[PDB]
Paper text:
Interleukin 4 (IL-4) is a pleiotropic cytokine that plays a major regulatory role in the immune system. Signal transduction of IL-4 is mediated by a sequential binding process, initiated first by binding of IL-4 to its high-affinity single membrane spanning receptor chain IL-4Rα. This intermediate ligand receptor complex then recruits one of two possible low-affinity receptor subunits, the common gamma chain (γc) or the IL-13Rα1 chain, into the functional hetero-trimeric complex to initiate signalling.
We tested the interaction model proposed above by mutating Arg85 of IL-4 and the super-agonistic variants to alanine and measuring the residual binding affinity to IL-4Rα. An even bigger effect is observed for the variant F82D-R85A. No changes in the local structure around residues Thr/Asp13, Phe/Asp82 or Arg85 could be observed (data not shown).
Numbering used by the authors: 1 to 129
The structure:
């Protein structure tokens, strides 16, 4: 369960997300990682999946993000698609939908995703030899 290939699905998706720049990767998410580190793994996954769901729900049809050019629109849709795929894997890992997130700090989506990538890669590393 804990070292399931879902971890690779998440990392693969994050690897793509972090190479993607759009009109709105600087808009913010609640920084779940600004905590002093006091939650179970499932709780961390639930919290990340929660703030990402907020983000894609709020920005999928946001006039600031939708794009003027074909390329801008494509990149927007690709980002939304990937966030939903990432989110779907996170909820699968969390096994939990109820996790309040109380952090004040907002970080850019771009910074959040790089941090979550680091945490996910660290989990993968602790699973393999």
């Amino acid at each position: 369960h804990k070292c399931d290939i879902t971890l690779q699905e998440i990392i693969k998706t994050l690897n793509s997300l972090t190479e993607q720049k759009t009109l709105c990767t600087e808009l913010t998410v609640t920084d779940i990682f600004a905590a002093s580190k006091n939650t179970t793994e499932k709780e961390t996954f639930c919290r990340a999946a929660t703030v990402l769901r907020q983000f894609y729900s709020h920005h999928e049809k946001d006039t600031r993000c939708l794009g003027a050019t074909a390329q801008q629109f494509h990149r927007h849709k690709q980002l939304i698609r990937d966030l939903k795929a990432l989110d779907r894997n996170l909820w699968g890992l969390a096994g939990l939908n109820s996790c309040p997130v109380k952090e004040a700090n907002q970080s850019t989506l771009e910074n959040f995703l790089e941090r979550l990538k680091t945490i996910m890669r660290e989990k993968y590393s602790k699973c393999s030899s």
